[PDB]
Design a binder for this molecule. Sequence first.
Ligand SMILES: [Cl-]
Ligand SMILES: [Cl-]
Ligand SMILES: [Cl-]
Lengths: 461, 459, 130
Amino acid sequence: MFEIKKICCIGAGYVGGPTCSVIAHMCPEIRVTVVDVNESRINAWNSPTLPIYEPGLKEVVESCRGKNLFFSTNIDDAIKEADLVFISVNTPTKTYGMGKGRAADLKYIEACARRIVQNSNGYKIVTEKSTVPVRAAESIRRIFDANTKPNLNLQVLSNPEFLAEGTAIKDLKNPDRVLIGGDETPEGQRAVQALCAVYEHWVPREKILTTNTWSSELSKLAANAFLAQRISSINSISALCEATGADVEEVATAIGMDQRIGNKFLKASVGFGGSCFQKDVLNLVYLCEALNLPEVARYWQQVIDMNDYQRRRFASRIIDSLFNTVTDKKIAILGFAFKKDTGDTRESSSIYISKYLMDEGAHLHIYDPKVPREQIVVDLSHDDQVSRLVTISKDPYEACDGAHAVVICTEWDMFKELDYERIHKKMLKPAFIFDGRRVLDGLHNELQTIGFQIETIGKKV
Amino acid sequence: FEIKKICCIGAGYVGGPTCSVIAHMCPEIRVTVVDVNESRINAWNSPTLPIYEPGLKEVVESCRGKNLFFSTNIDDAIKEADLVFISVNTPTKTYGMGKGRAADLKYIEACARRIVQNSNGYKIVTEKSTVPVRAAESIRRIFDANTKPNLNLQVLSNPEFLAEGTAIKDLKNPDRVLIGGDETPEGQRAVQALCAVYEHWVPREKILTTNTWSSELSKLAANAFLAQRISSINSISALCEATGADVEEVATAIGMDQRIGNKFLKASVGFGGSCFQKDVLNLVYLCEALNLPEVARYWQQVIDMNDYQRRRFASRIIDSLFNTVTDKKIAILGFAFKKDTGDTRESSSIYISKYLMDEGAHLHIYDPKVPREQIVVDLSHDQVSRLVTISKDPYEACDGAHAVVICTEWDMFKELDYERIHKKMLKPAFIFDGRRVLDGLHNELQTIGFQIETIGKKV
Amino acid sequence: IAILGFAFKKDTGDTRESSSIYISKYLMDEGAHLHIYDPKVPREQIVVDLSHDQVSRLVTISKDPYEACDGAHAVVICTEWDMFKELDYERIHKKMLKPAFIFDGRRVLDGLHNELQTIGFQIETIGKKV
Ligand SMILES: [Cl-]
Ligand SMILES: [Cl-]
Ligand SMILES: [Cl-]
């Protein structure tokens, strides 16, 4: 029945922006308007240089920007005209109050819901695109009901993202699945098929999944938690490997060849990072506590504790190997991003490893090929201590000059290609390499005969 | 170096089927399966085999007499062998340090001492059974301590991965073959020797070589990762019942993520079997012994969540029946730990029943495949006599019952005449679906008059 | 398993709160076949100190030390008897199962370690790294 002709997206983040640009690119007949209260982002989207970098995004936008793709600060008007309204604002973790540091703050979502109902009349479909806590759509439905008007029929849907930061465009153009949640009612089912129809322009019907609203909200959280659990599980095994003589990469491979388990996300590390994994797992844990499910809450909490353990354990090995004193010792930190090929440092294991070593009074020389200098200084403050202990190196070799140890915290490919023959000559002895990402796997016998003592995650010393 | 004669110690469901298959794909190799129990051997030489596996009878009959032999003459079979499979089961300790969690290596130790006594020259000794880590070190130590001139015993790890029920198919086309050996010149030779045997019918891409400790550890972790998947989706199921979400919907959405996959994501009253809990508990103990308490309590969560899932399910029944079940008739449908088997080992039905028995319920149990006497055994320590009745058919069990409890996903339960059952059930009549087998039938059952509750669905 | 010495200290028949009792009892909880020898302690006293059935299956009482080490996996010394130091350990080793262990709980074989090792024993004792 109802066809969606005009689409409004509230929020030009790395979620709402690319998703709608892709929609506009594969649905030339639909007018998609991306809006945001931040005047900074909108003008950037209208620039030859976009505010976020994704491969193939630059092409997608420019193909449509002006025809059926628009970026504006005019939020009110884009809502009035829209058949479908995407809510795509971030839900930051609460920094105070009931649920501090775990629970999601719904303030931006609540504001958007109140902003929508005020600026809209008639029939409109309201779909939450951002990662939200469960029963959030109940909150949106309740605001609409409390603020009803004659001839106002607002439908609330859930359609969460599943795009990996780095392969956004590919993930959107060829998704594993599209998830849509809606009320188990006639009105809701029509609204679902309206959105369902939009994605059918370029997504096969086999790969479009429809659930109720709560199943959809919960699926996004659980999916990220399952992923995080996989990493923490192989990481726990890594510690058991160091104690037995077993090897975690060998074990991971053997496990991953079981089709029922698969071989993705089984690479042990110093610990997972990113703006989603810990945040969503912690949000899940809080949710369970609030719903009197303490057994479930502490089940998933183990994913976080294990990741904290992995990091602390790694730092302690360094300190122990350096005779439990690191005071005034030069230490090279190679790699600061939470994963390779990005400048994002959010929840990076590099931050914590560094901070542990700073609490020992180490002289850290940090190098990262992509991460901006000012970001590192910010991520290590609350100040004075950063001034005393942290030096930021322009090149890897400048950082390993007179160092006691080389610590690799990000799996950058370039670190593998270093002249370790050169590095060793100007390191203090005994010289240590701690590989927290298994990037120097296969080079061990080389490095040892050069004179390095080399230790890594999931391999007995 | 080529392997010509193979001796396997232990004719269990591990060594038996594995060696019969090897003989079928390696006509040049003389495979001799031995066991100290004369009972087992004659069964293997009989038209009726001691264990049932699809296509096993065929594979065996192809080789039995030509290059496949079952004998009680262990000493001679060891003497002749280039490769010796140790394939005896390693039972959980029932007392002492590590009771109820740690593996007992007594049968493995006996085999190791028996080998070295009856062997000379070069031999490869391979552990086939699920063993605790560093077990091969124990075997190596017996060999080293009991050495002879010109004795070169090589120790390998080659664990099984066959699901009891489709063994032969799993063997003919395995996901991977795992071989662990010492990282030494002599050790690598023994590995490539065994590697060569499997190359007769297994592509080299699906043969993985690791050191001995990685191999032992991989078998435990693999089962644990699997068990964790079930416990994770089960934990989600409890969160679904509290939110209005539905666990079958969520499982589907998760499973479509290629990085996660959609296998082992079906919520249940709890997993069972002779491998999952045993291996996870063995893993946890290992971590404790090695001063890894963080890892130990991480994996323990898989067991606690499974225990929680069962207890949670039982409590819902009791609450729904007004927290009194004394002298109430309750039908228990399905006793096996999974559908299409008579195996009751660690079956969730056992615990659910036991919880309900501790409430003084009158349980009428039905299972289409599971033998009557097995149920009586699995429910003892007197209590069984007073409370447990075993029904020949489902309707005999639901005649005058307050509730119908489904604990095994048997396909036949989906097709029952619930109209008939309801008329002779006491009211209010309850159905507790612990396996999601009645998914899609809910609106039907409700209009009949049933209150129906299931795993991972708000009431 | 051979248990050498049952008294709480050497040169007495007193077994009251003897460490031999607990060591033996721990090993009994593992289902071991204990062969216990003590030159002075009366037979009936050992049986009493190891009761509350369990004793019958697992406890054998040797008249001489060598009856206890004949086919044993390990020798455990729980009392600092002077005589244990003077044993023919070359003989003991020949009829022990391998690997053969000596656990010295009283440091009585201090100075004999290199001898016992070259004979073929694995020897462990209180307060010395293995
Ligand atoms: Cl400081
Ligand atoms: Cl024999
Ligand atoms: Cl006992």
